[PDB]
Amino acid sequence: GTILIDLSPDDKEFQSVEEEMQSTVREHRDGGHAGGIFNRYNILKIQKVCNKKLWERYTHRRKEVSEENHNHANERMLFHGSPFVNAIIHKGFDERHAYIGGMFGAGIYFAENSSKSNQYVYGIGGGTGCPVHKDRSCYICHRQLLFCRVTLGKSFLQFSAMAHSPPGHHSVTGRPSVNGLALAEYVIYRGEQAYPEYLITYQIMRPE
Ligand SMILES: Cc1cc(=O)[nH]c2cc(-c3ccc(C(=O)O)cc3Cl)ccc12
Ligand SMILES: [Zn+2]
């Protein structure tokens, strides 16, 4: 029962979501290997993802976390890129989407930097790039990211040199320690702690 509603570029909701995507682009230490070389995106569309069942599943978990955490869900809006984006908007996040080899544990990963999530749209490491051209820096093919509502609850703070959550925690916060430009990443262990609120379709832009 998911329906996608197109936002008009003239709508303030479109404009705030586009500004979060654009303003959280950073340079990556791979020189663009995984996600391509760019400083900004061309946003083609932003759709609101509406699924009553998935939304209730998310608010039900959010109330349980918030009750375990002095009435504080610690809810954030974060990006998630994956080849499974079509399945996530219809069926929700789940364990099948956990990153088994993730540095901060086997869970589902979200990013503050949209350009970190862009690195994963075509798979771990950028996979083989776009399906059409096999190009991880393709400027033609349309990519998609989710901008998601995520319940962190009590988050374990892991400093990083760039399964279940640690006992008594509802998530993990991956704090960069070496690149003072990198924003945080977060990992959750139950799919019902994230709701894919917006589906953003875009291209990366070749720098001038
Ligand atoms: C760090 C991070 C940020 C993000 O926005 N998205 C991701 C997605 C995956 C991921 C996990 C499993 C698989 C697969 O089973 O094939 C694929 C991917 Cl892309 C892993 C990590 C991230
Ligand atoms: Zn392509």
Side-chain angles (χ1 to χ4, degrees), residues 1-94 97-208:
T2 298
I3 76 160
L4 305 181
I5 302 304
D6 229 339
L7 300 169
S8 165
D10 293 317
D11 190 329
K12 60 192 196 144
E13 201 177 349
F14 184 109
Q15 295 169 356
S16 56
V17 165
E18 165 165 18
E19 177 60 16
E20 189 70 358
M21 263 294 268
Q22 299 290 7
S23 72
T24 64
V25 168
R26 57 169 173 92
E27 307 205 296
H28 287 270
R29 295 170 104 216
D30 76 355
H33 182 85
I37 292 173
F38 62 96
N39 306 305
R40 58 185 174 125
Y41 307 106
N42 178 36
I43 300 303
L44 294 174
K45 190 184 270 329
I46 303 167
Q47 291 163 298
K48 177 156 248 173
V49 169
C50 309
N51 184 308
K52 206 171 163 296
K53 182 176 98 176
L54 298 182
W55 176 247
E56 292 179 352
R57 177 175 309 174
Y58 173 71
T59 67
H60 181 263
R61 174 62 181 161
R62 180 173 69 179
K63 181 175 174 292
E64 297 181 327
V65 174
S66 157
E67 287 177 358
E68 293 179 352
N69 192 49
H70 35 279
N71 307 312
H72 174 47
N74 198 13
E75 177 175 273
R76 303 301 173 81
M77 289 296 309
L78 296 166
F79 299 101
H80 179 81
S82 160
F84 310 129
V85 151
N86 184 234
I88 291 159
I89 66 176
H90 281 101
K91 283 166 267 152
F93 288 98
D94 75 23
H97 307 132
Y99 183 17
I100 312 297
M103 286 210 296
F104 298 120
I108 303 166
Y109 283 61
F110 293 85
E112 285 177 1
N113 284 114
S114 69
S115 66
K116 168 49 68 177
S117 286
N118 175 70
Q119 296 181 307
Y120 290 87
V121 165
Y122 295 130
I124 288 161
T128 54
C130 66
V132 179
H133 304 99
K134 303 187 177 24
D135 179 1
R136 284 184 295 265
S137 193
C138 193
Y139 302 105
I140 298 165
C141 284
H142 288 188
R143 300 172 180 221
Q144 290 192 309
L145 277 191
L146 296 175
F147 187 43
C148 302
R149 204 176 281 274
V150 185
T151 285
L152 295 183
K154 172 166 180 51
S155 195
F156 185 84
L157 181 59
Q158 172 69 236
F159 290 78
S160 93
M162 315 287 106
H164 312 89
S165 333
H169 292 82
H170 299 101
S171 62
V172 171
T173 294
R175 208 183 200 289
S177 58
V178 158
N179 188 356
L181 293 181
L183 303 179
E185 301 170 37
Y186 299 90
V187 182
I188 57 177
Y189 304 87
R190 280 154 145 283
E192 318 98 78
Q193 272 166 241
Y195 180 82
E197 286 232 334
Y198 301 94
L199 173 61
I200 301 167
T201 301
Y202 62 102
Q203 294 156 314
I204 52 161
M205 290 178 70
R206 183 186 307 264
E208 280 173 57

